[PDB]
Amino acid sequence: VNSFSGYLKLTDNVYIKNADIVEEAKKVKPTVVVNAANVYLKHGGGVAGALNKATNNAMQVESDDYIATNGPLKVGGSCVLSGHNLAKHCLHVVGPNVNKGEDIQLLKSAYENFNQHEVLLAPLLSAGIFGADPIHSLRVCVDTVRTNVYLAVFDKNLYDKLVSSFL
Ligand SMILES: C[C@H](CNC(=O)c1ccc2c(c1)CCC(=O)N2)C(=O)O
């Protein structure tokens, strides 16, 4: 039993809700919140900009030190950093950004990072400003993640379409 509330169960291990991931994280304080990161950990907009703003830019400060030490992530890769005031940890995961021409096949590799964590609060990878089809992202999530994932979908219209079209 966990404290995630109001989710629709899609499969044995995948759950979904129409919610703002920032407000969800502040309420639940999950062990892991997933960020929709880019390889530079530049948290300018989308989910990343919102999560970072909620940390009063502390996420960006920590991320800049991470990059200065380690260099950029790989598309499809991840790193674990602090969750600041939102969660114990933040798993920064880089899905492919279609608006940069990146290979959508890397979406499966991106979701594989979730399997290193027993329970996660997460957005749909490569959705929103990353330009991929969110219906496809949900399909890849369900077919790749085996650990317990709680998906927050900001857009109510999109949430209803994701549920209604889910096979
Ligand atoms: C399928 C799409 C992808 N978009 C996101 O995951 C997303 C985008 C921007 C923000 C948030 C989530 C949280 C609150 C916020 O301030 N910004 C959806 O979830 O609606």
Contact 131, 101 (CB under 8 A): no
CATH superfamily of 8-163: Leucine Aminopeptidase, subunit E, domain 1 (3.40.220.10)
CB contact set of 71 (below 8 Å; sequence gap of 6+):
none
Distance, in Å, from the CA atom of 107 to the CA atom of 81, rounded to the nearest integer, reads 21
- Which ligand 1 atom sits nearest the alpha carbon of residue 152? 19
DSSP summary character for residue 39? T
CB atoms within 10 A of CB 22: 19
Measured distance CA(85)–CA(59) in Å, rounded: 10
Atom of ligand 1 nearest to the CA of 128: 3
CB-facing half-sphere around the CA of 4: CA atoms within 13 A: 26
Per DSSP, 126 falls in state T
Distance 109 CA to ligand 1 centre (A): 21
How far is it, in rounded angstroms, from Cα 142 to Cα 148? 10
4 Cβ inside 6 Å of ligand 1: no
Nearest residue to 42 via CA among 102, 120, 121, 97: 97
Three-point CA angle 156, 58, 32, nearest 5°? 55
Q: How was this structure determined?
A: X-ray
Separation of 34 CA from ligand 1 center, angstroms? 12
CB atoms within 10 A of CB 64: 13
Distance of CA 90 to the CA centre of its chain: 9
Q: Is 84 helix (H, G, I), strand (E, B) or coil?
A: coil
Residues 54 and 85: beta-carbon distance below 8 Å: yes
The distance in angstroms from the start CA to the end CA of the chain is: 26
CA–CA distance, 78 with 10 (Å, rounded to integer):
25
Helices vs. strands in the chain: H and E counts, helices first: 6, 7
Residue for token pair 């830019």: 57
